[PDB]
Symmetry: C3
Subunit: 113 residues, 3 copies
């Protein structure tokens, strides 16, 4: 019987317990997956599963804001395009003289008066 | 032999089957990791691995759009800076009178005519 | 003893080794979780844990840029609102004639001169 007592004992050491052996490695695997504290700070605390689910919703969120902003900037580009194509005129010289508008330039009123 | 029959039976219950024991806990671990349905909605359906890979590419994507938008807004800020520094003039009073441009103000033409 | 030799051998095949059995499935599970090469390209290379932690910081980052850009565009919308509400005037006709400002329109100076 001493051979089977041997072999049997080897398998016990082998399956191990919560702290060692196959049973110890699997306990650690489930601890990591599930997590210690769901409202925890770390990935290990939350567990793999909860961390993946969180990243998921956060990505989804940033994406929504990014779709909204892209739209805002498109309207912004059109607003600026409009102002640029408006053909506004810049201030006339400030030199104590009166000016009027002719062919793109600002001309001295006194040249007609 | 009754002691070894004992010990042996204990290890069987211990390794368990697909539904229980160490074999049951590991089956669940591989189910979660791999997934039930890859084109599935949930993290558990897709499996941990596929979920992490997905978040990965999605992050990468939002990042590209965010780099592109940042550039668009930089050109926008310069376009607005330009329009602000242009020195355009605002509408002259609407009061039935003619005005001309002198030193920042709008002056009545009749003051020269 | 041949029955227990039987049962014992079955459990050995069952716990298996690094390559097969329960011991083989758990070895693979820990390989995937931890990773082969942390500065590796793939999710499997980095390990599940390191991949989740990475996605995490990257999401956090894109989020910061997205908060900053949103602010930039808000100031941009106000800058454009301001320019639009300014009431600037567009270029006067380019036809060899002098013009002055009256009631929204550009009038020929010669109509007073
Ligand atoms: Cl993730
Ligand atoms: Zn000229
Ligand atoms: Zn004045
Ligand atoms: Zn008219």
């Amino acid at each position: 019987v001493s051979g089977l007592n041997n072999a049997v004992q080897n398998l016990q050491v082998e399956i191990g317990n919560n702290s060692a052996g196959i049973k110890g490695q699997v306990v650690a695997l489930n601890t990591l997956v599930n997590g210690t504290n769901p409202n925890g700070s770390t990935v290990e605390e939350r567990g793999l599963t909860n961390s993946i689910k969180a990243n998921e919703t956060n990505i989804a969120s940033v994406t929504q804001e990014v779709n909204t902003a892209k739209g805002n900037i498109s309207s912004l580009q059109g607003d600026v395009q409009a102002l640029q194509e408006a053909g506004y005129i810049p201030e006339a010289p400030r030199d104590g003289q009166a000016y009027v508008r002719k062919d793109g330039e600002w001309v001295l009123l006194s040249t007609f008066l």
